[PDB]
């Protein structure tokens, strides 16, 4: 049994190393210690000081360098060192910030990235490979109770699986974290584990879905070299016997704007680099491809390579995944034609004509795009610069200037890419959905909280999604838990854990009074609206009124929202157009006539191509966002949730570099210490009267 065998890999990689006699000496010491701030300005930078004396209300302790005094009520005592490395921190004698951080630090120093924090798992990103996810590791966890084995993402996965069987109830695994924290990597491990322990081709296809989604939906940002630019909820489906019977991927709104623009040092989606790097000699000839430097959509950020990544090798992996999932050779070629055509479209250079209208003097890129997409270049050209619209009921050809022609070209590109992405997901789902499920375990992997030098509409929706997920944790850990105690009248005094995202949520998504998204929508159908009338409206409603909103004095085009994870300043430029998400009908007519079997589906299949109406306007992105989020939240409320809190160690994507204030900020806004306290102070288990304890109105509550 590897669990008891101290030579095993399990012991080596998942267990705290045996301390030595010098450490035993320290462990049985009568000395007592405190965590203190050498600099009272720097509340997150702690050192250890020996407590040398005490009064009834104070401690005196030595500093690393001198003696200081502190009220006992303000003291962060250090735990006896026998607790250092503890697997479940609800066991600590002293639950404070530097103690919780210290335990995570001891474990992390030994590459022990997983730690329990009472009922939920904490996962600190190692930023290096640790060999704890082999089949041999999977096999050790299979069937084991949480307290029988070391902390691991596999153990929580197994717990949910047995709960699903024993309780005949759907489960969810909700993996939280800021950008780069490890949500996607842990999501993949859960799927790996479930497919293995409950498996019977289908399993291999479930796994191979991932390189396809990542190639098209992930990109280098300044926060993560492999950032998910779309959120997903993966349902792993099980029959009544508990075997895997299928899977379904709900994908959420994709950051389409990245196709046409990337900030300095970032990349576009990985697939662009993968094609250019990995294509055959005359794949490249057939698609008129050159290197990334030659394409406007890949040559702006100054970054075309990711350290440690071979895009040509990744392309091979993407294509192998497409084969396994079952995309035909013709389908793959059309996918790649769409990618190439998008790059060509980006190379179209509109110029001023004799008048205000734009012209295309060089048609090389137009012609190359049209050839690969299988559309008529003359029709495309007219649709870009001279699209027809109604004015009342009259049909009027516009003549767009350079900036509008360029923005229409970008709108086409983003629609092609977003529709392509939806089509990939649909094709995958058709393969993976082969049986009506009896049960599911859903794994949620959102785009995580993020802050850049410039934050736009996409960042607000992303950060709002993270705020809502944190609120879901708060609801389940604190609110529902105490509501139950209180309804069962079990002698409980209600505790205000001071974690409530409600104010920020209402600010963003309020309906009456209208919140930010509501006002955005109102401005979006207002014919005279501009990005300036929009910001003016937001300030008018919220400035000096809403405690989570700030009208900055340093800018006229930004507003601040205080999120659980910190204040973010949002730039309003392009929000009206981003929300309306327009696309000239004439461009759709052009592509509806494509000779390509995949391109034609993107434009004629209503599930991919149609857009809902709300009265006399197309549904806005904000309304679409809201619908998708409401849908997810409704599904989650039908499951039993399990939470995994991913924690990023630093903001450099480096191993062995745990940063105090980076980590402590997350422990605070995540509610980790609050979550430990409710575990300790409360009554986790209750049973209708069955036939340290509490008798309720209908149930016996226990610890
Ligand atoms: N458990 C892990 N083992 C090894 N590397 C990891 C682990 N978790 C995260 N990483 C590294 O951190 C990067 C970002 O993690 P990821 O899961 O993509 O973040 P996100 O939370 O943004 O989905 C990964 O690409 C990988 O290099
Ligand atoms: C998880 C989730 C649920 C509902 C909507 C979501 C997400 C998400 O996590 C996202 O798919 C990530 C990006 N995003 C988005 C992109 C552009 C504009 C607006 C939003 C997201 N929207
Ligand atoms: O960087 V992550 O968007 O995958 O949170
Ligand atoms: Mg991710
Ligand atoms: Mg600024």
Swiss-Prot record:
Modification after translation: Phosphorylation inhibits thick filament formation and reduces the actin-activated ATPase activity.
Cystine residue pairs: none
Region span, Actin-binding: 629-651, 694-703
Myosin N-terminal SH3-like domain boundaries: 29-80
Localization in the cell: Cytoplasm, Cell cortex
Domain Myosin motor: 84-703
Residues annotated as binding ATP: 177-184
Domain of life: Eukaryota
PTM sites of type N6,N6-dimethyllysine: 128
Subunit structure: Myosin-2 heavy chain is two-headed. It self-assembles into filaments. Hexamer of 2 heavy chain subunits (MHC), 2 alkali light chain subunits (MLC) and 2 regulatory light chain subunits (MLC-2). Associates with elmoA.
Domain notes: Limited proteolysis of myosin heavy chain produces 1 light meromyosin (LMM) and 1 heavy meromyosin (HMM). HMM can be further cleaved into 2 globular subfragments (S1) and 1 rod-shaped subfragment (S2). The rodlike tail sequence is highly repetitive, showing cycles of a 28-residue repeat pattern composed of 4 heptapeptides, characteristic for alpha-helical coiled coils.
Record function comment: Myosin is a protein that binds to actin and has ATPase activity that is activated by actin.
Family: Belongs to the TRAFAC class myosin-kinesin ATPase superfamily. Myosin family.
Note: Dictyostelium myosin-2 has no K(2)EDTA ATPase activity, perhaps correlated with the absence of a Cys at the SH-1 position (688).
Protein name: Myosin-2 heavy chain
Encoding gene per record: mhcA
Segment of the intact protein contained: 2 to 747 of 2116
């Amino acid at each position: 049994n590897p669990i008891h065998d101290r030579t095993s890999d399990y012991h080596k990689y998942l267990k705290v190393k045996q301390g030595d006699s010098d450490l035993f000496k320290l462990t049985v010491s009568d000395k007592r210690y405190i965590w203190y701030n050498p600099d009272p300005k720097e509340r997150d930078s702690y050192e250890c000081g020996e407590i040398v004396s005490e009064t009834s209300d104070s401690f005196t302790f030595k500093t690393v360098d001198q003696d200081r005094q502190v009220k006992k009520d303000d003291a962060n005592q250090r735990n006896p060192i026998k607790f250092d490395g503890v697997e479940d921190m609800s066991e600590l004698s002293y639950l404070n910030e530097p103690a919780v951080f210290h335990n995570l630090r001891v474990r992390y120093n030994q590459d022990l990235i997983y730690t329990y924090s009472g009922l939920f798992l904490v996962a600190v990103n190692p930023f290096k490979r640790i060999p704890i996810y082999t089949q041999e590791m999977v096999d050790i966890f299979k069937g084991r109770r949480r307290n029988e084995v070391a902390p691991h993402i596999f153990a929580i996965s197994d717990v949910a699986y047995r709960s699903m069987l024993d309780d005949r109830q759907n489960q969810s695994l909700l993996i939280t974290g800021e950008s780069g924290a490890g949500k996607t990597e842990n999501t993949k491990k859960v799927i790996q584990y479930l497919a293995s322990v409950a498996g019977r081709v289908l399993e291999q296809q479930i796994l191979q879905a991932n390189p396809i989604l990542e190639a098209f939906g992930n990109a280098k940002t300044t926060r993560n070299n492999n950032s998910s630019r779309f959120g997903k909820f993966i349902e792993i489906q099980f029959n009544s016997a508990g075997f895997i019977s299928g899977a379904s991927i709900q994908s959420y709104l994709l950051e389409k704007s990245r196709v046409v623009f990337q900030s300095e040092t970032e990349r576009n989606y990985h697939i662009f680099y993968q094609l250019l790097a990995g294509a055959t000699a005359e794949e490249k000839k057939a698609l008129h491809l050159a290197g990334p430097e030659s394409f406007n959509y890949l040559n702006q950020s100054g970054c075309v390579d990711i350290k440690g990544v071979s895009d040509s090798e990744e392309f091979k992996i993407t294509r192998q995944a497409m084969d396994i999932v079952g995309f035909s050779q013709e389908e793959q070629m059309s996918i790649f034609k769409i990618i190439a055509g998008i790059l060509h479209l980006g190379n179209i250079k509109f110029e001023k004509g004799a008048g205000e209208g734009a012209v295309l003097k060089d048609k090389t890129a137009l012609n190359a795009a049209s050839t690969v997409f299988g559309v008529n270049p003359s029709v495309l050209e007219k649709a870009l610069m001279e699209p027809r619209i109604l004015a009342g009921r009259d049909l009027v050809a516009q003549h767009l200037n350079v900036e509008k022609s360029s923005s229409s070209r970008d709108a086409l590109v983003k629609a092609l890419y977003g529709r392509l992405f939806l089509w990939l997901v649909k094709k995958i789902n058709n393969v993976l959905c082969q049986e009506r499920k009896a049960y599911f375990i859903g794994v949620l992997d959102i785009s995580g909280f993020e802050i850049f030098k410039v934050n736009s509409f996409e960042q607000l929706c992303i950060n709002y999604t993270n705020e809502k997920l944190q609120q879901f944790f708060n609801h389940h850990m604190f609110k529902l838990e105490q509501e139950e105690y209180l309804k069962e009248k079990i002698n409980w005094t209600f505790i205000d854990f001071g974690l409530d995202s409600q104010a920020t949520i209402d600010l963003i998504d309020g309906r009456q009074p209208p919140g930010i998204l509501a006002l955005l929508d109102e401005q979006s159908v207002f014919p005279n609206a501009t990005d300036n009338t929009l910001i003016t409206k937001l300030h008018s409603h919220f400035s000096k009124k809403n405690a989570k909103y700030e009208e900055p004095r340093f800018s006229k085009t930004e507003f601040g929202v205080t999120h659980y994870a910190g204040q973010v300043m949002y730039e309003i430029q392009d929000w009206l157009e981003k929300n309306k998400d327009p696309l000239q009908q004439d461009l759709e007519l052009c592509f509806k006539d494509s000779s390509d079997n995949v391109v034609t589906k993107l434009f004629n299949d209503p599930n991919i191509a149609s857009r809902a109406k709300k009265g006399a306007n197309f549904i806005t992105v904000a309304a679409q966002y809201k619908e998708q989020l409401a849908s997810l939240m409704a599904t989650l409320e039908t499951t039993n949730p399990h939470f995994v809190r991913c924690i990023i160690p630093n903001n450099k994507q480096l191993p062995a570099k745990l940063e105090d204030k980076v980590v402590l900020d997350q422990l605070r806004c995540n509610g980790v210490l609050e979550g430990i306290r409710i575990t300790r102070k409360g009554f986790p288990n209750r049973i209708i009267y069955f036939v340290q304890y509490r008798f309720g109105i209908t149930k016996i509550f226990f610890r």
